[PDB]
Symmetry: none
Subunit: 108 residues, 4 copies
C-alpha cells in the first residue's frame, strides 16, 4: 500500500542530545503524517499531526518536518521523560500504515 520506512530502529543517547528520526514514504503522502509516542504498556499518543503540527500540550522540544516522501521527527534536547518508542503513521491512503518504530533509550 504505502510503506513507511523508519530509521533508526533503535537508539540510545544522553539527556540534552538532539535526536533525529526519519520516515520515508513509498509514495507522495504530502504532509499526511502523524508522529506518535508510545511509552511501554501505553497506547500511541499523538505528538505531531499534519507532519509538522504539534498537538496541544506537547513540549516544544518535539518537532517534525518534511513533505512528500521524507519526514523527520526531531527531539531537540532529550529529557529523561522521553524514553519510549516513536512512530510515524501516514493517513493519506488506507490502510493507514505505520513505520517500524524507533526505540529511544537514555543512558545514565
Amino acid at each position: 500500500d504505502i510503506q513507511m520506512t523508519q530509521s533508526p530502529s533503535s537508539l540510545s543517547a544522553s539527556v540534552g542530545d538532539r535526536v533525529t528520526i526519519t520516515c520515508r514514504a513509498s509514495q507522495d503522502i504530502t504532509n499526511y503524517v502523524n508522529w506518535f509516542q508510545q511509552r511501554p504498556g501505553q497506547a500511541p499518543k499523538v505528538l505531531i499531526y499534519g507532519a509538522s503540527i504539534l498537538e496541544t500540550g506537547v513540549p516544544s522540544r518535539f518537532s517534525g518536518s518534511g513533505s512528500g516522501t521524507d519526514f523527520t521527527f526531531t527531539i531537540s534536547s532529550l529529557q529523561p521523560e522521553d524514553i519510549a518508542t516513536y512512530y510515524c503513521q501516514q493517513y493519506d491512503t488506507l490502510p493507514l500504515t505505520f513505520g517500524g518504530g524507533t526505540k529511544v533509550d537514555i543512558k545514565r
Copy 2:
C-alpha cells in the same frame, strides 16, 4: 478530539476461545475505525479498516463490526500467535486517536 474507549484492557484466554473487544467513540464516526494488532516489540499492523473491512492477507478469524459510535472486534478462535495488544483508531476527525488497547493473553 474524539475519545475512543476500549474494553477490556486485558484478557487472558485459552487458545480456541472467542474474543470480543469493543470501541466506543465519543461521537459519530460512521465507520472510520482501524483495528490494529501490535505484537510485542513490533509496530501496529492494520487488521481491519472501514470498521469491518479485512486487510489483505489477514486471517478470517478476525472480524470487525459497528457503525456510528460502537464497534466490535472479534477473534473467532484465539491462536497461540494472536497474543498482542489490539487497538482501535478513529480516522474521522483530526488528529487520529487510539483507544487504550487490549492486551490479549494466553493461559496455561
Copy 3:
C-alpha cells in the same frame, strides 16, 4: 580540555538507511575533526579528516560536514559491511580527544 559529545551512543538500522551521527565540540575547533571506523578488535581507521575530507579508498557513501562546534558524519546508505563503532576526534588542541563512539548495528 576540548570535550567531544557524540550522539547517539548506539543505533540499529537496516541496509539502505541513512545514518546521521553528530559531534559537538566544547569550543571552536574549526574543521579539525577526524571520523574513525573501528571494527571489533581493530584499530580505529581514518575515514574522514579535515572534517570533510574522505580518505583515499573510503566508499563515497561516507561523508562529513560542519565547522566550529557541530560536526555531522552521514552514512548515505548503510551497507552490511558498516557494522562497527564510529568516532570523532578533535585534533585542534592536545590532548586530541575522542567523542564517546556510536555503536552501529544492522538488523536482519
Copy 4:
C-alpha cells in the same frame, strides 16, 4: 601516510607485572605520539601525549618515552583495571594514524 607499528599485539600479564609496548614510526615524528587506553565498550582515552607527557589525573605507573621513530609505553605494575587495548597515534603528519593496538590481559 605514517605507518605506526605496535607490539606485542596481545599480552597476558599477572597483576603486579611490568608492561612495555612499543611503537615504531615509518618516519621521523619527533615526539608527536599519543598513547590511548581503550576500555572494553568505551572510547579511547588519552594517557600520554607529546610521547612522554602524562595526562591530568593519569596514574603514574604509566610512562612514555621515545623521540624520532621508536616509542615505548610502560605500565609499572599491571592493575586489575588496566585491562584494555592501548594504542599509539602519531600527530605529526595528516591524517593522524594509529598503530594496531595491544590487547593487555590478566591471567589467573
